[PDB]
Amino acid sequence: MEMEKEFEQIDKSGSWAAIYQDIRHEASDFPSRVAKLPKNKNRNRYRDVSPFDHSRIKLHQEDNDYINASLIKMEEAQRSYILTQGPLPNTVGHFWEMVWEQKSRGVVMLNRVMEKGSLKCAQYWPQKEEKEMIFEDTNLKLTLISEDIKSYYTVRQLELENLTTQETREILHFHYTTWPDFGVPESPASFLNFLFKVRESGSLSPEHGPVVVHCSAGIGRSGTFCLADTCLLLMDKRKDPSSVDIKKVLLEMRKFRMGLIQTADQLRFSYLAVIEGAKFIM
Numbered sequence: 001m002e003m004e005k006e007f008e009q010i011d012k013s014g015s016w017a018a019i020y021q022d023i024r025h026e027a028s029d030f031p032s033r034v035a036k037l038p039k040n041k042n043r044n045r046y047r048d049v050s051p052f053d054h055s056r057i058k059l060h061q062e063d064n065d066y067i068n069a070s071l072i073k074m075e076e077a078q079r080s081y082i083l084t085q086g087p088l089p090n091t092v093g094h095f096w097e098m099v100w101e102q103k104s105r106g107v108v109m110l111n112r113v114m115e116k117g118s119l120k121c122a123q124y125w126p127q128k129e130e131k132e133m134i135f136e137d138t139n140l141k142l143t144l145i146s147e148d149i150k151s152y153y154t155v156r157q158l159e160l161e162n163l164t165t166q167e168t169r170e171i172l173h174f175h176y177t178t179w180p181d182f183g184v185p186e187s188p189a190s191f192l193n194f195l196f197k198v199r200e201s202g203s204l205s206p207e208h209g210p211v212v213v214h215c216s217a218g219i220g221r222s223g224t225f226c227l228a229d230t231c232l233l234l235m236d237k238r239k240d241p242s243s244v245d246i247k248k249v250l251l252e253m254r255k256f257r258m259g260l261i262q263t264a265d266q267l268r269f270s271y272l273a274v275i276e277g278a279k280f281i282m
């Protein structure tokens with residue numbers, strides 16, 4: 001069923017809450033035993049948001065390989081994403097170890113460091129060129145190269161150095177700075193514009209490791225970003241763009257990380273984004 005007609009039918013019937021609970025009921029339940037070990041308590045931001053064992057990213061170290069991060073592998077779309085929590089004071093070094101080890105080109109940040117008067121993630125990148133950051137626990141150096149501030153997003157060029165080998169790489173930081181503290185954006189216009197700058201950059205392409213995507217918990221805004229990107233790519237690839245079922249794509253993604261899309265408004269917004277996205281190429 002053409003999702004735009006499906007959309008108007010759910011709006012006129014006011015049934016977003018019912019559709020969203022049906023997704024919650026059908027979603028996969030896999031173990032997260034490593035996340036719950038007592039040694040990992042200060043590596044989790046939220047007690048109820050954990051990576052599954054089967055899809056978790058492992059750090060390359062014998063001491064403790066754990067990070068709150070998941071590999072979402074979309075077979076038909078030929079896209080992979082790493083979805084992770086906003087880094088904590090004691091996991092900023094782990095975060096950058098993961099970017100290095102997975103060969104990522106891009107980091108996508110969908111939150112502000114402070115929202116609703118509380119800290120949603122650590123200040124994990126340098127704010128000035130001449131004040132670089134050293135992560136002693138993982139042996140990495142991070143330098144700000146340039147910053148481009150726009151009305152709805154900021155792009156940063158960063159240099160990550162593995163101090164063990166003196167190898168360096170360029171990382172691109174895509175920071176969506178205008179998601180409102182409550183609810184979802186009135187239009188998906190700027191969020192859809194933001195996605196195409198990340199793509200534009202090469203950060204989502206198969207010559208690189210998977211993009212790292214985060215918000216505060218790494219399931220709500222982060223889930224909206226990957227769901228919109230995958231649905232748009234499938235509508236390009238297939239003979240019948242109307243065969244793309246957003247609810248079925250979301251349940252496929254929930255095989256790899258729990259809780260993706262946190263509210264009926266984020267669902268409605270995700271539908272809105274693809275519908276309005278499919279339409280702008282016409």
Ligand SMILES: CCNC(=O)Oc1ccc(-c2csnn2)cc1
Nearest residue numbers: 189192193196232276277278280
């Ligand atoms: C209000 C919508 N228009 C807008 O602001 O920007 C864009 C940019 C790109 C796409 C796209 C290409 S392939 N799937 N979606 C959609 C919208």
